[PDB]
Design a protein around this nucleic acid. Sequence first.
RNA 1: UACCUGGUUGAUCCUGCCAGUAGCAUAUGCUUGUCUCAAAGAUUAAGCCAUGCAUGUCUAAGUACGCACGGCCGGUACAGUGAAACUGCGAAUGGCUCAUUAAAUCAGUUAUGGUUCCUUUGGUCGCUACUUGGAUAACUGUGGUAAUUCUAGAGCUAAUACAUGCCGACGGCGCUGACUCCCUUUGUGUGGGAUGCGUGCAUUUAUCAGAUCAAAACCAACCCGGUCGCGGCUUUGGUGACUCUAGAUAACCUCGGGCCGAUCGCAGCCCUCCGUGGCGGCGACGACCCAUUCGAACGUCUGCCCUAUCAACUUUCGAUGGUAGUCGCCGUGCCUACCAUGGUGACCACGGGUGACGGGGAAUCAGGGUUCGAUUCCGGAGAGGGAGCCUGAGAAACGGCUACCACAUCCAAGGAAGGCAGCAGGCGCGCAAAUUACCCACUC
RNA 2: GCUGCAGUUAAAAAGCUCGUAGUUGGAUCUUGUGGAGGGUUCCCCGCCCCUUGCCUCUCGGCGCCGGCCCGAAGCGUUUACUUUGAAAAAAUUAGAGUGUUCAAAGCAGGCCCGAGCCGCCUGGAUACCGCAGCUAGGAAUAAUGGAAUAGGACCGCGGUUCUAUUUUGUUGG
RNA 3: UCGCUACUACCGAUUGGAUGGUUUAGUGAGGCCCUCGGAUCGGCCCGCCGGGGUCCCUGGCGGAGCGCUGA
Lengths: 263, 158, 65, 206
Amino acid sequence: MARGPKKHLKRVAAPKHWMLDKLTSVFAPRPSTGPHKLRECLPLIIFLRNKLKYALTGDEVKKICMQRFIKIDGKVRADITYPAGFMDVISIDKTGENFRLIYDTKGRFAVHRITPEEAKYKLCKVRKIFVGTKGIPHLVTHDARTIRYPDPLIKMNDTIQIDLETGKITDFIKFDTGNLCMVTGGANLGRIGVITNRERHPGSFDVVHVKDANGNSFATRLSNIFVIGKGNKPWISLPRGKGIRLTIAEERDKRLAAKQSSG
Amino acid sequence: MADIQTERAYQKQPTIFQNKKRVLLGETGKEKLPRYYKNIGLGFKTPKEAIEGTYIDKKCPFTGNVSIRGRILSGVVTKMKMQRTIVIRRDYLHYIRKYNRFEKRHKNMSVHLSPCFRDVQIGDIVTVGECRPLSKTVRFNVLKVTKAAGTKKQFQKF
Amino acid sequence: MPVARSWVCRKTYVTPRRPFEKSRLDQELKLIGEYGLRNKREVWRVKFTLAKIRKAARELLTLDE
Amino acid sequence: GISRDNWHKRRKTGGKRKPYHKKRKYELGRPAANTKIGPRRIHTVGVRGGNKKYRALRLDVGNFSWGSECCTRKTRIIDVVYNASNNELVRTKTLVKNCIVLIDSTPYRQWYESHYALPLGRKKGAKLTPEEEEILNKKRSKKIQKKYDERKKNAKISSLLEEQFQQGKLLACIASRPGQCGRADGYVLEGKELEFYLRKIKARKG
RNA sequence: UACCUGGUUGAUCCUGCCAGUAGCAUAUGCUUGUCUCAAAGAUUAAGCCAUGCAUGUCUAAGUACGCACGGCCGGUACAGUGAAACUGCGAAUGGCUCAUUAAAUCAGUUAUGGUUCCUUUGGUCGCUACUUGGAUAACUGUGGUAAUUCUAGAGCUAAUACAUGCCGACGGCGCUGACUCCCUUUGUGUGGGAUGCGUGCAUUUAUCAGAUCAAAACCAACCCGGUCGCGGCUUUGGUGACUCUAGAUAACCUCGGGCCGAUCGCAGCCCUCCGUGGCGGCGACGACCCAUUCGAACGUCUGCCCUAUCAACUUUCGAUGGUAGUCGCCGUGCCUACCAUGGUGACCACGGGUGACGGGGAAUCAGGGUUCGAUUCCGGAGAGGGAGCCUGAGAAACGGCUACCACAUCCAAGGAAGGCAGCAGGCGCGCAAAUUACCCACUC
RNA sequence: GCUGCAGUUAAAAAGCUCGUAGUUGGAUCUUGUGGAGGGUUCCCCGCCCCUUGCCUCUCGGCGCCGGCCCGAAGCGUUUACUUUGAAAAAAUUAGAGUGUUCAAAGCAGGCCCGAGCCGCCUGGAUACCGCAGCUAGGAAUAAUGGAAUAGGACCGCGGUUCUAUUUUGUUGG
RNA sequence: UCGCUACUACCGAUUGGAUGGUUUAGUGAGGCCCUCGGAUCGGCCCGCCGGGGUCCCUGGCGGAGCGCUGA
Ligand SMILES: [Mg+2]
Ligand SMILES: [Mg+2]
Ligand SMILES: [Mg+2]
Ligand SMILES: [Mg+2]
Ligand SMILES: [Mg+2]
Ligand SMILES: [Mg+2]
Ligand SMILES: [Mg+2]
Ligand SMILES: [Mg+2]
Ligand SMILES: [Mg+2]
Ligand SMILES: [Mg+2]
Ligand SMILES: [Mg+2]
Ligand SMILES: [Mg+2]
Ligand SMILES: [Mg+2]
Ligand SMILES: [Mg+2]
Ligand SMILES: [Mg+2]
Ligand SMILES: [Mg+2]
Ligand SMILES: [Mg+2]
Ligand SMILES: [Mg+2]
Ligand SMILES: [Mg+2]
Ligand SMILES: [Mg+2]
Ligand SMILES: [Mg+2]
Ligand SMILES: [Mg+2]
Ligand SMILES: [Mg+2]
Ligand SMILES: [Mg+2]
Ligand SMILES: [Mg+2]
Ligand SMILES: [Mg+2]
Ligand SMILES: [Mg+2]
Ligand SMILES: [Mg+2]
Ligand SMILES: [Mg+2]
Ligand SMILES: [Mg+2]
Ligand SMILES: [Mg+2]
Ligand SMILES: [Mg+2]
Ligand SMILES: [Mg+2]
Ligand SMILES: [Mg+2]
Ligand SMILES: [Mg+2]
Ligand SMILES: [Mg+2]
Ligand SMILES: [Mg+2]
Ligand SMILES: [Mg+2]
Ligand SMILES: [Mg+2]
Ligand SMILES: [Mg+2]
Ligand SMILES: [Mg+2]
Ligand SMILES: [Mg+2]
Ligand SMILES: [Mg+2]
Ligand SMILES: [Mg+2]
Ligand SMILES: [Mg+2]
Ligand SMILES: [Mg+2]
Ligand SMILES: [Mg+2]
Ligand SMILES: [Mg+2]
Ligand SMILES: [Mg+2]
Ligand SMILES: [Mg+2]
Ligand SMILES: [Mg+2]
Ligand SMILES: [Mg+2]
Ligand SMILES: [Mg+2]
Ligand SMILES: [Mg+2]
Ligand SMILES: [Mg+2]
Ligand SMILES: [Mg+2]
Ligand SMILES: [Mg+2]
Ligand SMILES: [Mg+2]
Ligand SMILES: [Mg+2]
Ligand SMILES: [Mg+2]
Ligand SMILES: [Mg+2]
Ligand SMILES: [Mg+2]
Ligand SMILES: [Mg+2]
Ligand SMILES: [Mg+2]
Ligand SMILES: [Mg+2]
Ligand SMILES: [Mg+2]
Ligand SMILES: [Mg+2]
Ligand SMILES: [Mg+2]
Ligand SMILES: [Mg+2]
Ligand SMILES: [Mg+2]
Ligand SMILES: [Mg+2]
Ligand SMILES: [Mg+2]
């Protein structure tokens, strides 16, 4: 039977970009309900023992999190399967280090340490616009936040830079032809380039083009574009190799020349 | 035209009112009834007949209460005996891949034809769109009639 | 029951179709003597790992340069 | 129980379908309300996801509106006369949507009088004299034409309507499902609907 | 590795099949040293089941007078550990099997502008009060029956259970109009105006508006540049598309049957000042509606094995459609009343069979194909057969309840109790399938 | 036996013709040069009449010294076909990297200081995913269409009619 | 053709037997809904006692309509 919501998640059926093994055991953490979709999230448990190696078994994650050390967007989260996701800024005070969840160019999250004078603001993508009771205009971002009284020029698909202690958006980039963008869905995942186009098929999945810093172009769907810069100048810091998605015939050459077989 | 109520209940368009003010027109005047109509989108021009006409159909996509959304299809007419709705046919080719050859198939569909279009004939092509379920087996409303293929409706002085 | 295991495994040889054929038996017996192997199967392994290389080589050579 | 499933009944081609599962709960039926007339009796039912739902039996009063004058007043409901779908609901006086009812029409008279300073359907001049004429004629001189001439050229209650008040019962149409909102609201007949239903009532019954 | 070989004749050339040959998976026979992996009551009987176990849960933070243990003597809200018991939550996931089921289920593709959503995340939280009511469990004591996770009577007492109900800060505005104040008696041009009713969000009905468009000429009142007849001006948001969102008006209101805190734990302060008046922090909990999340539900296009010794089928016992309702979470013959006579078929309808649950996949494979998929991932369906329902955000739930059918257990013959297609185990069935072991250390 | 069998005599062409569905259908409606990549003509531009085929605009950026020039909006009569993009769960399959002591497997692992580095490097690719639906180029082959008792284009004009809401400041006639 | 021995299916008096599914006619457990019903348990209205105040308000005991009202 299914008569209600499920609550376990099998290890094989889990998302691929979690990069889980196969022979530990039958289950996977099953992210809890949150602001980020179940396939797009990264639970806090998978970030501390599969990536940062800080813990070793699930109980060590539970007793790291209980001591109130970890902060997800300023607030102090105690749930180990909390669904962190794209544009969230984990902070570990007791160590003095910070991170930004951004897709690496193979289409998966990777650790990306940032300077503590940067981990005070995060970007959000506008999803909806509506006028509440008494005539107040609202906003909905990709991570479920609701901003009341936003500027009357910010529209859908735009990006806004908020603060983590107030909300209260500060800057906003407008979606049009010429601005930077990072792609967050499908085949082209974690690539960067100027938008350069947008076609519009009314009633079905408008399509968007892009263009890398090496001529490479790659279409996508508009609901997968995420503007991160005014133009050619990304606001937030970037991972190494900057979304350039080199082919395997190049990846082999760099592996051979660097001879990165040790340290 | 002025007599349209034939059922056991009064037929009127909702979202439309009959005021009772300013009685002076003289020897005749306005019918005392405006018309409700809306646009469909996607590039479909509402037929002038829907505007100027005087009829009631809660399902007509140009005046009544339905929204067009999803698939758009087209097919040739094959029967119109049920009232306000017709039966159309769609022919296509399945592909048997053991052999490298096609095979002919067809499927019949019931659609709903508003009284806006009035001059349809068996053989006409019609372009239809997707609605909410309007009956047991009807999911599609007629959006645009045409006789644009040969053996056309009228002879060659049009 | 669901279980934490790999069922993945595979065979590493293929018996010959003609079971009693002299041109075959004398060649393989020669190859067993000259390298000191144990069964015929120790030869059919090598035959397999070569005949499988020669399929990738061929399917590449039938691509365009 | 009773159910509103699609799968119990046959397809376009006229061929049966064999049962696919046991009746689910989300296909649930429940029996008719059959609102009668009388002192209020409202029950409630729990529907999918909490969400109280008020079933109404034995109603008496309705918040009817008068579209031309923008008035609307809680009014007693006197009777049902015509039912546009089945006729044996008027023989048993069940009160459902788009029924046709007679109401009391008194508060509309009171509003019209006090607003336009004029008389509606009356019989004589004897009853109006001992009281309620102290409202029609006033102390006022300033105001009494400064506004009451703004109420002149407008008091032209239609003949079909004016003929009704002389009995004190008005034809009205329900616009709310009593069995799902507990209330029996609606509007009062104007214009051409009036002629329609006058014809229909005089035609069928009697 | 794109392959053949024996057999009709006295001999020959053919058609043609039977036999050999290689893999695979179920059974079985003979044999067995090492070491790493690891399938295993599917086939027959979705047949029947002895015993044990598989679902419980407490923090600084709902309710502590068990002396049950307890310390420095005191509860003077009251310490502190805390059994039990009320309260909350979960029990609808997981596991097992493959009987049903052929446009059904299922897959890819799309839609909710036609709906519901416990929880999480973010919004939203101002039209006797220094704190109200009566009544239960655990506990004390008396009991009944052969018997059960059976329960009766009496004596006490809690709340985040149950049930009532304030204070603040309204100075709001609209409609009303006794009046009074100037110029026109009036009418019409003036400004105040006490007295009165409505005046938060949500629910239900009805109405209103939801602007700009291309220019001129005569008549009345008229802004402004300024005077006793001319040039110059106008107002949320969104969609491909709304009977959307926001706004205005007149009302309506669910009580016993919507909301705006009579709840709980750590850490502090000011006093026209001496503990009261006052105010400052951090949480736990609950809650209306909106969004978001996990879904769920219904719907569109295309896709199926064998059968003509199944050629016409469907319909007042709704079959296809229209109008109005009932019902339902919403769309809908879903169901009722009236009306029309329709819908499907040689491009195989409808009926029948399937040792048929669908798919991701498996075996063999020059190229094309043939056969398999009960079986660890995803979807569906069912707990002996059929049926009905309680509680809940979620069930037509069987480790829930009620009744009939078939089985079966206990008895003091009055009555009571039951569901291994969970894990082991047993009978039966058969060619055919493991121990009534150990443990929450790993994944969750 | 689609690639791919057979029907005189070996198993087998209805006794004979007509005929609706089904399957199959004759020919025909535009070519050379100046530059570009590849040679010694021929295969992104425009030229014999055409070359993305035009239009006419309007609102907003790109130019020159207002005036005039070119990108976008309409789509070209419709399909099938072919090519490219988008979007498609993992495991299994093919395939890359990595001495499990080799292999089947697995997703790991690799480096130097004796500890005094309180560490460093790097991986967890990629391809496939029929049909049906979505998206943009090509126009050979195959369906399909335009005026024959006509109606195409130029502001060409007369008759006749409904009607839009702007300006003359607004409000009203 | 007749005659022998083994095996396979066919027809058929019995109007076979069983099993399962259909189905007209009649009955119909049990739950839900509705219209009733009212076992029983309360509160406010009149005395005596204790508190306040000028006989009323509280708390208790008893009794009269138990009148009304609630579950
Ligand atoms: Mg389950
Ligand atoms: Mg079930
Ligand atoms: Mg979780
Ligand atoms: Mg709810
Ligand atoms: Mg012979
Ligand atoms: Mg011989
Ligand atoms: Mg053989
Ligand atoms: Mg062998
Ligand atoms: Mg082992
Ligand atoms: Mg096996
Ligand atoms: Mg079995
Ligand atoms: Mg047992
Ligand atoms: Mg405690
Ligand atoms: Mg305590
Ligand atoms: Mg409990
Ligand atoms: Mg629960
Ligand atoms: Mg088992
Ligand atoms: Mg079933
Ligand atoms: Mg069938
Ligand atoms: Mg069948
Ligand atoms: Mg289908
Ligand atoms: Mg699907
Ligand atoms: Mg589907
Ligand atoms: Mg919970
Ligand atoms: Mg909240
Ligand atoms: Mg007691
Ligand atoms: Mg209907
Ligand atoms: Mg209806
Ligand atoms: Mg017929
Ligand atoms: Mg027919
Ligand atoms: Mg059938
Ligand atoms: Mg199968
Ligand atoms: Mg079966
Ligand atoms: Mg193959
Ligand atoms: Mg299967
Ligand atoms: Mg089976
Ligand atoms: Mg099994
Ligand atoms: Mg399953
Ligand atoms: Mg699904
Ligand atoms: Mg059983
Ligand atoms: Mg619950
Ligand atoms: Mg059940
Ligand atoms: Mg269960
Ligand atoms: Mg039970
Ligand atoms: Mg029982
Ligand atoms: Mg059981
Ligand atoms: Mg068992
Ligand atoms: Mg045996
Ligand atoms: Mg075995
Ligand atoms: Mg056995
Ligand atoms: Mg554990
Ligand atoms: Mg042959
Ligand atoms: Mg012969
Ligand atoms: Mg022959
Ligand atoms: Mg012949
Ligand atoms: Mg030809
Ligand atoms: Mg592999
Ligand atoms: Mg390997
Ligand atoms: Mg496949
Ligand atoms: Mg395709
Ligand atoms: Mg094309
Ligand atoms: Mg002409
Ligand atoms: Mg015999
Ligand atoms: Mg015999
Ligand atoms: Mg027989
Ligand atoms: Mg029988
Ligand atoms: Mg019978
Ligand atoms: Mg009956
Ligand atoms: Mg009964
Ligand atoms: Mg009954
Ligand atoms: Mg009652
Ligand atoms: Mg009663």
